[PDB]
Enzyme design. Structure first.
Site, mmCIF file in Angstrom:
data_model
loop_
_atom_site.group_PDB
_atom_site.id
_atom_site.type_symbol
_atom_site.label_atom_id
_atom_site.label_comp_id
_atom_site.label_asym_id
_atom_site.label_seq_id
_atom_site.Cartn_x
_atom_site.Cartn_y
_atom_site.Cartn_z
ATOM 1 N N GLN A 160 22.548 39.912 -23.232
ATOM 2 C CA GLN A 160 21.268 39.216 -23.357
ATOM 3 C C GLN A 160 21.463 37.938 -24.109
ATOM 4 O O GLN A 160 21.879 37.903 -25.312
ATOM 5 C CB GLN A 160 20.204 40.120 -24.015
ATOM 6 N N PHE B 11 9.422 42.675 -20.859
ATOM 7 C CA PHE B 11 8.358 42.175 -21.702
ATOM 8 C C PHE B 11 8.958 41.955 -23.085
ATOM 9 O O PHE B 11 9.387 42.891 -23.726
ATOM 10 C CB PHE B 11 7.233 43.189 -21.828
ATOM 11 N N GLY B 12 8.918 40.717 -23.547
ATOM 12 C CA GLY B 12 9.454 40.294 -24.854
ATOM 13 C C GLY B 12 8.387 40.630 -25.890
ATOM 14 O O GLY B 12 7.191 40.374 -25.679
ATOM 15 N N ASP C 7 11.272 44.912 -24.462
ATOM 16 C CA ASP C 7 12.377 44.450 -25.247
ATOM 17 C C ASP C 7 11.957 44.239 -26.706
ATOM 18 O O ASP C 7 11.084 43.422 -26.978
ATOM 19 C CB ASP C 7 12.926 43.141 -24.705
ATOM 20 N N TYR D 253 8.824 39.843 -29.537
ATOM 21 C CA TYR D 253 8.893 39.091 -30.804
ATOM 22 C C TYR D 253 7.721 38.128 -30.937
ATOM 23 O O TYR D 253 7.360 37.437 -30.001
ATOM 24 C CB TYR D 253 10.153 38.284 -30.897
ATOM 25 N N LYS E 120 17.803 46.824 -30.653
ATOM 26 C CA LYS E 120 18.968 46.070 -30.968
ATOM 27 C C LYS E 120 19.376 46.410 -32.426
ATOM 28 O O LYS E 120 18.534 46.600 -33.323
ATOM 29 C CB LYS E 120 18.717 44.572 -30.802
ATOM 30 N N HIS F 108 22.909 43.072 -31.540
ATOM 31 C CA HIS F 108 21.987 41.906 -31.466
ATOM 32 C C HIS F 108 22.690 40.542 -31.572
ATOM 33 O O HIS F 108 22.311 39.620 -30.935
ATOM 34 C CB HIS F 108 20.929 42.011 -32.582
ATOM 35 N N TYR G 269 12.560 42.558 -35.517
ATOM 36 C CA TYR G 269 11.250 42.067 -35.097
ATOM 37 C C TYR G 269 10.167 42.688 -35.922
ATOM 38 O O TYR G 269 9.035 42.189 -35.916
ATOM 39 C CB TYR G 269 10.987 42.315 -33.591
ATOM 40 N N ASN H 296 -0.989 37.054 -24.778
ATOM 41 C CA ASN H 296 -2.231 36.666 -24.159
ATOM 42 C C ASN H 296 -2.518 37.509 -22.897
ATOM 43 O O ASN H 296 -1.736 37.529 -21.970
ATOM 44 C CB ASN H 296 -2.147 35.192 -23.828
ATOM 45 N N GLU H 297 -3.652 38.210 -22.849
ATOM 46 C CA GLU H 297 -3.970 39.066 -21.696
ATOM 47 C C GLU H 297 -3.816 38.393 -20.316
ATOM 48 O O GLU H 297 -3.272 38.996 -19.371
ATOM 49 C CB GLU H 297 -5.399 39.551 -21.844
ATOM 50 N N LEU I 120 11.127 31.068 -20.787
ATOM 51 C CA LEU I 120 10.044 30.083 -20.699
ATOM 52 C C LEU I 120 10.130 28.955 -21.713
ATOM 53 O O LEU I 120 9.132 28.253 -21.912
ATOM 54 C CB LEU I 120 8.653 30.744 -20.813
HETATM 55 N N1 LIG Z 1 18.495 38.713 -28.236
HETATM 56 C C1 LIG Z 1 18.006 37.683 -28.895
HETATM 57 O O1 LIG Z 1 18.681 37.080 -29.726
HETATM 58 C C2 LIG Z 1 16.746 37.204 -28.521
HETATM 59 C C3 LIG Z 1 16.367 35.874 -28.838
HETATM 60 C C4 LIG Z 1 15.132 35.352 -28.468
HETATM 61 C C5 LIG Z 1 14.256 36.103 -27.710
HETATM 62 N N2 LIG Z 1 14.623 37.420 -27.405
HETATM 63 C C6 LIG Z 1 13.714 38.274 -26.614
HETATM 64 O O2 LIG Z 1 13.162 37.512 -25.512
HETATM 65 C C7 LIG Z 1 11.746 37.484 -25.646
HETATM 66 C C8 LIG Z 1 11.161 36.225 -25.069
HETATM 67 O O3 LIG Z 1 11.813 35.051 -25.608
HETATM 68 P P1 LIG Z 1 10.903 34.208 -26.587
HETATM 69 O O4 LIG Z 1 9.945 34.980 -27.388
HETATM 70 O O5 LIG Z 1 11.579 33.067 -27.003
HETATM 71 O O6 LIG Z 1 9.726 33.437 -25.730
HETATM 72 P P2 LIG Z 1 9.754 33.154 -24.103
HETATM 73 O O7 LIG Z 1 9.338 34.255 -23.222
HETATM 74 O O8 LIG Z 1 10.448 31.988 -23.587
HETATM 75 O O9 LIG Z 1 8.222 32.521 -24.093
HETATM 76 C C9 LIG Z 1 7.707 31.738 -25.065
HETATM 77 C C10 LIG Z 1 6.235 31.310 -24.958
HETATM 78 O O10 LIG Z 1 5.719 31.278 -23.680
HETATM 79 C C11 LIG Z 1 4.336 31.527 -23.722
HETATM 80 N N3 LIG Z 1 4.037 32.021 -22.349
HETATM 81 C C12 LIG Z 1 4.240 33.241 -21.813
HETATM 82 N N4 LIG Z 1 3.771 33.307 -20.533
HETATM 83 C C13 LIG Z 1 3.310 32.064 -20.252
HETATM 84 C C14 LIG Z 1 2.749 31.515 -19.147
HETATM 85 N N5 LIG Z 1 2.586 32.278 -18.067
HETATM 86 N N6 LIG Z 1 2.343 30.213 -19.142
HETATM 87 C C15 LIG Z 1 2.483 29.421 -20.288
HETATM 88 N N7 LIG Z 1 3.054 29.972 -21.432
HETATM 89 C C16 LIG Z 1 3.476 31.287 -21.386
HETATM 90 C C17 LIG Z 1 4.165 32.553 -24.841
HETATM 91 O O11 LIG Z 1 2.943 32.333 -25.575
HETATM 92 P P3 LIG Z 1 1.694 33.417 -25.500
HETATM 93 O O12 LIG Z 1 2.247 34.571 -26.261
HETATM 94 O O13 LIG Z 1 0.610 32.682 -26.179
HETATM 95 O O14 LIG Z 1 1.324 33.700 -24.047
HETATM 96 C C18 LIG Z 1 5.405 32.342 -25.682
HETATM 97 O O15 LIG Z 1 5.051 31.699 -26.829
HETATM 98 C C19 LIG Z 1 11.453 37.713 -27.174
HETATM 99 O O16 LIG Z 1 10.060 38.094 -27.386
HETATM 100 C C20 LIG Z 1 12.508 38.799 -27.461
HETATM 101 O O17 LIG Z 1 12.197 40.141 -26.934
HETATM 102 C C21 LIG Z 1 15.856 37.943 -27.777
HETATM 103 C C1 LIG Z 2 13.434 38.951 -40.479
HETATM 104 O O1 LIG Z 2 14.837 38.612 -40.216
HETATM 105 C C2 LIG Z 2 15.168 38.246 -38.910
HETATM 106 C C3 LIG Z 2 16.550 38.130 -38.633
HETATM 107 C C4 LIG Z 2 17.030 37.770 -37.364
HETATM 108 C C5 LIG Z 2 16.126 37.498 -36.355
HETATM 109 C C6 LIG Z 2 16.615 37.169 -35.082
HETATM 110 C C7 LIG Z 2 15.681 36.930 -34.056
HETATM 111 C C8 LIG Z 2 16.070 36.472 -32.732
HETATM 112 C C9 LIG Z 2 15.557 35.017 -32.469
HETATM 113 C C10 LIG Z 2 15.440 37.189 -31.571
HETATM 114 O O2 LIG Z 2 16.061 38.179 -31.193
HETATM 115 O O3 LIG Z 2 14.329 36.770 -31.143
HETATM 116 C C11 LIG Z 2 14.307 37.047 -34.337
HETATM 117 C C12 LIG Z 2 13.829 37.411 -35.592
HETATM 118 C C13 LIG Z 2 14.725 37.630 -36.633
HETATM 119 C C14 LIG Z 2 14.224 38.023 -37.897
#
Ligand SMILES: NC(=O)c1ccc[n+]([C@@H]2O[C@H](COP(=O)([O-])OP(=O)(O)OC[C@H]3O[C@@H](n4cnc5c(N)ncnc54)[C@H](OP(=O)(O)O)[C@@H]3O)[C@@H](O)[C@H]2O)c1
Ligand SMILES: COc1ccc2cc([C@H](C)C(=O)O)ccc2c1
Length: 316
Positions: A187, A18-19, A47, A21, A81, A114, A52, A270-271, A216
């Protein structure tokens, strides 16, 4: 019971995470609620990250759901992270302890580096000079990694890994003299428009699990992501497949990852979509469907993090 993968350190990671951010303008309250709902829906892997700015809320959700008898701590896999202002080795454990203090958890299940570009130490996560230039730092990530390994030995992180590493940077760690613990994972961004086959095979060859983010097609938040880039979920083949299976394009994208041995994250606040996403375990895709999804690949990277472009360790 729930689906997990064995990590190279012998720990287990649930294959759906579960993401957490959301953009700064979404109130933090929504993280608390969303994480509770995620746990209720069946997510066992959460996650987050220091950057965040939600660990107070995410930790409260987890504490609440343990205290209310819904779940035991051992059936929550929580990831934080290490942010790039604390790459210096003496700063790694304080950063982990700060996160633990914000979370009010005793340990994290996974602690990740990270992003491989380092920035100046201090309180600001994106430190800028008076002219707005990011203040980059020069740090040996192999020493950062030793400090991570000590956090594992301290019990503060059950497992340690990386994020947004490329081949070179992973090799850098794997080939490190005196290496004690390999990273359990890398990741990185992964979805049908950027399926990371090459890096995925590399990771498998080293028994490193690839954890997919933006599976997604991402939050699509400006300025992190270009608003002109193609909408993943609007893809005709994914919609065709969804329509066929009486599912959703999101579900097809998540299932694709799980069948190819990737651990997949999905953010939603979203629930209804939170509950929908756990349905990934209710259907399966054929070899022909899987190949069709492979053909979507088109080298589209949503998350460049290019404000950190320039230094040698910039990974893309
Ligand atoms: N390590 C890193 O650098 C890094 C980078 C980016 C992301 N992450 C991690 O990965 C997580 C997810 O990546 P991400 O936030 O980019 O978004 P992601 O999961 O690809 O999803 C993005 C969008 O999809 C929508 N969504 C979710 N379920 C859906 C569904 N069933 N049907 C239609 N839309 C749907 C969400 O909106 P709603 O909220 O409105 O449902 C969200 O805005 C982050 O929250 C974070 O924990 C890590
Ligand atoms: C306030 O400052 C930040 C710095 C780095 C960030 C990296 C990320 C990435 C996209 C991520 O792991 O989703 C998100 C938010 C962030 C906020």
């Amino acid at each position: 019971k729930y689906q997990c993968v064995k990590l190279n350190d012998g720990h287990f990671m649930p294959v759906l995470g579960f993401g957490t951010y959301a953009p700064a303008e979404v109130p933090k309250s929504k993280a608390l609620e969303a994480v509770k709902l995620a746990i209720e829906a069946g997510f066992h892997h959460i996650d987050s990250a220091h950057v965040y700015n939600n660990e107070e809320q995410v930790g409260l959700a987890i504490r609440s759901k343990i205290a209310d008898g819904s779940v035991k701590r051992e059936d929550i896999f929580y990831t934080s992270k290490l942010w790039s202002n604390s790459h210096r080795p003496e700063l790694v454990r304080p950063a982990l302890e700060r996160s633990l203090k914000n979370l009010q958890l005793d340990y994290v299940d996974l602690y990740l580096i990270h992003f491989p570009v380092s920035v100046k130490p201090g309180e600001e996560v994106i430190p800028k000079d008076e002219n707005g230039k990011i203040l980059f730092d020069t740090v040996d990530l192999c020493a950062t990694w030793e400090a991570m390994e000590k956090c594992k030995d301290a019990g503060l992180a059950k497992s340690i890994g990386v994020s947004n590493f490329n081949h070179r940077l992973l090799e850098m760690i794997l080939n490190k003299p005196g290496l004690k613990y390999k990273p359990v994972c890398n990741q990185v961004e992964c979805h049908p428009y950027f399926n990371q086959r090459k890096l995925l095979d590399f990771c498998k060859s080293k028994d490193i699990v690839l954890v997919a983010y933006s599976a997604l097609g991402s939050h699509r938040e400006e300025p992190w992501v270009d608003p002109n880039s193609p909408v993943l979920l609007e893809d005709p083949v994914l919609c065709a497949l969804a329509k066929k299976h009486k599912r959703t394009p999101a579900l097809i994208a998540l299932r694709y990852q799980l069948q190819r041995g990737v651990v997949v994250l999905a953010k939603s606040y979203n629930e209804q979509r939170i509950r929908q996403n756990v349905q990934v375990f209710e259907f399966q895709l054929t070899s022909e469907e899987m190949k069709a999804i492979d053909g979507l690949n088109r080298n589209v990277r949503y998350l460049t993090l290019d404000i950190f472009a320039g230094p040698p360790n910039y990974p893309f």
